[PDB]
Amino acid sequence: VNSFSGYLKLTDNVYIKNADIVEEAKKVKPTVVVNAANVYLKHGGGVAGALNKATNNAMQVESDDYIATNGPLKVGGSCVLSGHNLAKHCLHVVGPNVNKGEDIQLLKSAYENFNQHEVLLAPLLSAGIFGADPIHSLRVCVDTVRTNVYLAVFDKNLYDKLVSSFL
Numbered sequence: 001v002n003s004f005s006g007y008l009k010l011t012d013n014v015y016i017k018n019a020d021i022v023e024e025a026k027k028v029k030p031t032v033v034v035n036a037a038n039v040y041l042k043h044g045g046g047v048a049g050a051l052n053k054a055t056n057n058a059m060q061v062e063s064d065d066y067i068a069t070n071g072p073l074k075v076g077g078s079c080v081l082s083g084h085n086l087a088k089h090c091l092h093v094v095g096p097n098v099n100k101g102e103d104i105q106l107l108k109s110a111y112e113n114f115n116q117h118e119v120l121l122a123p124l125l126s127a128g129i130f131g132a133d134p135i136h137s138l139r140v141c142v143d144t145v146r147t148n149v150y151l152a153v154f155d156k157n158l159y160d161k162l163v164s165s166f167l
């Protein structure tokens with residue numbers, strides 16, 4: 001029994017809710033929040049810009065030190081950093097950005113990173129400004145992630161379509 005509330009159950013291990021992931025993180029303070037990162041950990045916009053803003057830019061400062069030491073992530077890769085005021089940990093996961101011509105097949109690899117964590121609060125990878133079809137992202141999530149994932153979908157009309165079209 002954990003502290004997530006108001007989610008619709010899609011499968012044995014995948015749950016979904018129409019929510020702002022920032023507000024959900026501040027309310028639940030989960031062990032792991034997933035960021036929709038890019039390989040440079042430049043948290044400008046979308047989920048990343050919103051999470052970073054909620055940390056008063058501390059996420060960006062930590063991220064810049066990580067990149068200065070380690071170099072960029074891979075598309076499909078991840079790193080674990082602090083969750084600051086929002087979570088114990090932030091798992092920064094890089095889904096492919098369709099708007100940059102990255103291979104959508106890397107979306108499955110991106111979701112595999114979730115399996116290293118028992119429970120996560122997460123957005124749909126490669127959705128929103130990353131340009132992939134969110135219905136496809138949800139299907140890859142369900143078919144790839146085996147740990148317990150609580151998906152926060154910002155847009156209510158998308159959250160209604162995702163739930164109504166779910167197989």
Ligand SMILES: O=C(O)Cc1cccc(CNC(=O)c2ncnc3ccsc23)c1
Pocket residue numbers: 123124127128129133134135152153154155156157158159161
């Ligand atoms: O909500 C999120 O977490 C990510 C997000 C945030 C803002 C705007 C979008 C873009 N909207 C959509 O892709 C969308 N909307 C409504 N019906 C559909 C049906 C197929 S795509 C689609 C996505």
